[PDB]
């Protein structure tokens, strides 16, 4: 039997599924360590690797990209977990090697591949403390081209009054996602700052792991794909909505939690986001 991880229910994705919307025909690039395409609870539609020494994007030697991919799009069937957008067209854009790191140029090359291949949504469960002009230009280009770009806020916790949101999350063109648990409490590690946009579940998140496994991971990396998957559900119900509109729908319909420095606009609610009229609950 299939299990629905709590975070998929928490963001109200089953309300979209019951309406008949599951992300069909929406192209989501998981820009990450690869995706294990042999996993029976994933269907990978395509991809490319920007990692010079790891040329196969369908081999995930780390595990992280496979876990992120399952939160976006684990298949709706009788096994494993259920993804937020289980019919999405999932693309493995490998820019991180086995050790979980990549060079800025590899990340930018993956964003450029996503733009050239007409991705609707990019998920970046990754970050670093410094930006670069070239990284900012790649994300701004993807957004100018119509792509919804979602990233983890980072796991740098608090530092007095300073922002600790990393890049590319910290760029205004990117939706930076922090992590809450099942009680809607901010995870102690979740980055903070005025660039924090929305929150999603990022504690003890069950998803797919390589070699036909499943397991619970923690991080803003886990929160980000709930929002990327929610964007794919919204686009499957409203295929002409722009990325501007998808982003605003998610921002404008959160459940407000605490102070925005710690919680941004609150927890996403994809049921409310996918209505025509938007307000907070």
């Amino acid at each position: 039997a299939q299990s629905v991880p709590y975070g998929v229910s928490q963001i109200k994705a089953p309300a979209l599924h019951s309406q008949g919307y599951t992300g069909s025909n929406v192209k989501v690039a998981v820009i990450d360590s690869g995706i294990d395409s042999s996993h029976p609870d994933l269907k990978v539609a395509g991809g490319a690797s920007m990692v010079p020494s790891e040329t196969n994007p369908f081999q995930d030697n780390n595990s992280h990209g496979t876990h992120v991919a399952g939160t976006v799009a684990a298949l709706n069937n009788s096994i494993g977990v259920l993804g937020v957008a289980p019919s999405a067209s999932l693309y493995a854009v490998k820019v991180l090697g086995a050790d979980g790191s990549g060079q800025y140029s590899w990340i930018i090359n993956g964003i450029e591949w996503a733009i050239a291949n007409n991705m609707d949504v990019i998920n970046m469960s990754l970050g670093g403390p410094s930006g670069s002009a070239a990284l900012k230009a790649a994300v701004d280009k993807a957004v100018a081209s119509g792509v919804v770009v979602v990233a983890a806020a980072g796991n740098e916790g608090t530092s007095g009054s300073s922002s600790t949101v990393g890049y590319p999350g910290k760029y205004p063109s990117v939706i930076a996602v922090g992590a809450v648990d099942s009680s809607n409490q901010r995870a102690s590690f979740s980055s903070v700052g005025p660039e924090l946009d929305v929150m999603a579940p990022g504690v003890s998140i069950q998803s797919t792991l390589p070699g036909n496994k499943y397991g619970a991971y923690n991080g803003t990396s886990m929160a980000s794909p709930h929002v990327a998957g929610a964007a794919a559900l919204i686009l499957s119900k409203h295929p002409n909505w722009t990325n501007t509109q998808v982003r605003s729908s998610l921002e404008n319909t959160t459940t407000k939690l605490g102070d925005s420095f710690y919680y941004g606009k609150g927890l996403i609610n994809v049921q409310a986001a996918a209505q025509h009229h938007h307000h907070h609950h």
Binding site: S101, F189, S224
Partner: protein, 63 residues
């Protein structure tokens, strides 16, 4: 102890020794400063970001 600001500017070797005294089961991974990394949180891990001289270039922290 979950952060080691006193290690910035030290060699990677000293940093490893010190972190393993405080957290002997730590999974230490050495990465180049200025890379982008996965944003998962691993309580057992300490990433050490080094400059091109193999000195610590960012405050080591658990995660």
């Amino acid at each position: 102890k979950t952060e080691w600001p006193e290690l910035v500017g030290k060699s990677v070797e000293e940093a490893k020794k010190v972190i393993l005294q405080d957290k002997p089961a730590a999974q230490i991974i050495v990465l180049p400063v200025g890379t982008i990394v996965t944003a998962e949180y691993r309580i057992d891990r300490v990433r050490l970001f080094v400059d091109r001289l193999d000195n610590i270039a960012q405050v080591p922290r658990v995660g």
